[PDB]
Scaffold this active site. Structure first.
Site, mmCIF file in Angstrom:
data_model
loop_
_atom_site.group_PDB
_atom_site.id
_atom_site.type_symbol
_atom_site.label_atom_id
_atom_site.label_comp_id
_atom_site.label_asym_id
_atom_site.label_seq_id
_atom_site.Cartn_x
_atom_site.Cartn_y
_atom_site.Cartn_z
ATOM 1 N N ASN A 206 0.847 -1.185 0.000
ATOM 2 C CA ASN A 206 0.000 0.000 0.000
ATOM 3 C C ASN A 206 0.887 1.240 0.000
ATOM 4 O O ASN A 206 0.860 2.068 0.907
ATOM 5 C CB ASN A 206 -0.989 -0.007 1.158
ATOM 6 C CG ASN A 206 -1.993 -1.138 1.056
ATOM 7 O OD1 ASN A 206 -2.612 -1.346 0.014
ATOM 8 N ND2 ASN A 206 -2.128 -1.906 2.119
ATOM 9 N N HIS B 171 -6.576 -14.216 4.625
ATOM 10 C CA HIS B 171 -5.186 -13.759 4.703
ATOM 11 C C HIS B 171 -5.078 -12.535 5.607
ATOM 12 O O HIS B 171 -4.109 -12.394 6.361
ATOM 13 C CB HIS B 171 -4.668 -13.472 3.286
ATOM 14 C CG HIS B 171 -3.208 -13.095 3.182
ATOM 15 N ND1 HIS B 171 -2.791 -11.836 2.783
ATOM 16 C CD2 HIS B 171 -2.076 -13.829 3.324
ATOM 17 C CE1 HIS B 171 -1.470 -11.798 2.727
ATOM 18 N NE2 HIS B 171 -1.012 -12.995 3.053
ATOM 19 N N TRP C 172 3.952 -7.947 7.390
ATOM 20 C CA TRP C 172 4.278 -9.136 8.175
ATOM 21 C C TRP C 172 5.603 -9.006 8.905
ATOM 22 O O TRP C 172 5.822 -9.674 9.921
ATOM 23 C CB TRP C 172 4.340 -10.352 7.265
ATOM 24 C CG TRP C 172 4.933 -11.558 7.913
ATOM 25 C CD1 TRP C 172 6.204 -12.033 7.772
ATOM 26 C CD2 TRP C 172 4.271 -12.443 8.807
ATOM 27 N NE1 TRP C 172 6.370 -13.166 8.526
ATOM 28 C CE2 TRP C 172 5.194 -13.437 9.174
ATOM 29 C CE3 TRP C 172 2.983 -12.487 9.339
ATOM 30 C CZ2 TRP C 172 4.867 -14.464 10.045
ATOM 31 C CZ3 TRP C 172 2.658 -13.500 10.190
ATOM 32 C CH2 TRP C 172 3.593 -14.477 10.542
#
Lengths: 154, 154, 154, 154, 154, 154, 154
Positions: G23, G88, G57
């Protein structure tokens, strides 16, 4: 004609305030208006006696020991009652009101009624500060007028 | 911290009351509360100057001649507006309010707003004496506090 | 208490009437009531100054030259506004009203508001002669009272 | 009675025309009617001063420099506003109108209002040439009458 | 006929840009277009004065200190307003617009209006870069034309 | 390019806080955030002047006496408006906002707007402490930035 | 009573900013607010260490090498997570949060959480600059207060 009426000047008067603890949040805004009224109308805050009781059920018995002292001109009862699931509301509401009114004829002394009897949590917040203006500043105003008129009428 | 605030004692103050004539019935209950407030808070009724204008449209110009005299501490504007069939309501409501607010910054003097802007004839009767308690006794209370605070702040 | 109020006698007063031309039909019945009021309350029709402007938009600027002459005690603004297809109504209605009210605080002189702000052609005919009784005879009555009260208050 | 009124003869008068550029298509038909009116009523086209500004927002500030020159008798404001998706319409419409009206009391000079405030693109085309007849030829006619009446009234 | 009109050349002009901080994301794309316009039309970026204020409410007061300096030819106001749950939108929108327009007649200087008044977050993104093309590059173009025309007209 | 912007350090600044009394409950949480902001950004609480007025209608006139004293760098207006049954909301909301904005151009001093204009009692509680974070801590932050930037820009 | 609390002054503090790359569009507006907060509260931008990791992550492992250096007082984690078609979202959201919280008890150092967990692309744009005001300027403010309080409490 004779016309009797209390002025709104609070000088020389000594007050008692019986304030429950349950609904901690809303009662503390009523007691706030009540003292506020008495000070800005010209009374000192030293001559306020503030009494705290655990629930609204016991406002009667403790306003009975304030209203018997000689140096108290008027007593204010301040507590919040919100209806819940059961009729517990009614039988407590019905008794707070009789002990206060029964006490006033007995001791021939003004006991004004600053008890909010609300159906939803909404309406209790409106009568405790916001769009209807706190009972506490109101029930206090009612007693300043009464304790003032009861100099003339006794 | 410095805290400024007006007490509610009306002694020594001299007041002006600009009261329309239209809606003869409801305005006369507001003017009644207004004088009532000023007398029972300790002010004399001699020091009230009462001015009458034909409609609510002209409250601005006449409160402008009261607010310029030196011996007026605060001015109260008292008039009733009820909505009818046309937008006549809005353009009169919108102008009463700007002339009063525009006047208060100009002459640096409190002009409190005791104008009832009601939608039905019902709600006007409720704010003029019954279940909401007259603006007139209220807008008068607002000015007693302001004219009192403006001794300290000027 | 001091009570100020205008009587309804029109003798000695000199008036100004600013009357639009648009809606030729309805305005001519308002100007008719207005002069009618002033004559039957005791004023002469010589001392009426009648000014005509093309639309209702320009009532402000021309009532500004009448209200500055010394020999005019009150000014009447007479025009008809009917809503049509567009918001043209609102922005003209909103400005006629501010120029008239803004002018009255400036020149400290009564300018009464005889502008019909109607939604349908129906309601304009009712307020111009028939079941509600012409604004023109009314706004004129409002000024006779004001110009009379402003002898006492100035 | 004194009756004042402007004739419709345009000889000797000198005019100002403030015309936005946005909505290039419709404004150019209004400016066309406006000059057309002034010439066929007897005024020369030399004595027209035409000013162009980028949007309708700036008509106020630029009509303020035309209305201050001595040799301008009346000023015409010509611009098209069409409502779109947002309230951008309202706050621009509301301000064009106050700057024009506020300017006219200040400089005591006629500023007529030739601004089309249309809701659909349809209604704007009808008031710019077709079934309702251009504001431009109309707002120009309003100023010829006013600038003519303001010889008598000043 | 005299025709006045601003060319679009930006050489020699010195600009002021008042840009709120709230809606950090969208305002920074407007300020980007605004400087972009001024540089590619031939103005230097040294002669741009950029001022930042916390909200859109204060654009009026700070554009008032830029518009008073002598060496500023035009001022651009750039801020984003998005409607939310409450009428907070309206009273801020209504005031940003009056302070900007009121300022322009006072200081007789162009203040162009680059304020996006959007109803959804969607329409604000479209007028800030994408399918309608940034107000910022537009309100800047409007001022280059005005500040250029105001050499001739003063 | 010149970039002006206020830092967020509150040392050396002296503040004024005009806080209505109506809606006693919610206003006292805004004033709480406001002082809180000023102290934790490095300002002393001695240099805060706190003024109390009866309603939100009079915030304009009293912020006008704070904003004229020399030793006040910025003024905060703090009041709660809740819509009720009538349009009383609108005409008070519309005037609080014009007196504050009109005052800021006049006295060329920052007056930030900490007025909650809520539709339900719900949304007022959310903007006064809970899921949206008090205006009071926000309008105070806006003034610390402005009063800091107005050292550079004057 | 002992009251501990962080002031909001950023001088002397050295900061770490761990910012994902995925993003790209929305994260770059958060990092922008974050540095912005730290500079305008008085911190230098030299003492900011900015670290970039490929996804959200891995914010845990890399904020673990910043939080171990001695000269970092607080660490900010800045990343955007948007829900898509699959779960997810959840298992990445659930782990970013445990590694950040688990790290803070381990290294006894503030790690504030500037992760936007949005359901639609809409709500992510609102919390990254527009109607809710960037987390980035917020999570940075939270760390300035914490790293300041952790001088007193260690």
């Amino acid at each position: 004609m004779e016309i009797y009426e209390g002025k709104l000047t609070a000088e020389g008067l000594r007050f008692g305030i019986v304030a429950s603890r349950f609904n901690h949040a809303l009662v503390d805004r009523l007691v706030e208006g009540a003292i506020d009224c008495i000070v800005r109308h010209g009374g000192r805050e030293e001559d306020i006696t503030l009494v705290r009781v655990p629930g609204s059920w016991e406002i009667p018995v403790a306003a009975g020991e304030l209203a018997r002292k000689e140096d108290i001109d008027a007593v204010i009862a301040i507590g919040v009652l919100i209806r819940g699931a059961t009729p517990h509301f009614d039988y407590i509401a019905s008794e707070v009101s009789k002990g206060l009114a029964n006490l006033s004829l007995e001791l021939r002394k003004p006991i004004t009624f600053g008890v909010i009897t609300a159906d939803t949590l909404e309406q209790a917040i409106e009568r405790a500060g916001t769009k209807h203006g706190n009972k506490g500043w109101e029930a206090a105003l009612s007693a300043i007028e009464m304790a003032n008129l009861f100099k003339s009428l006794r």
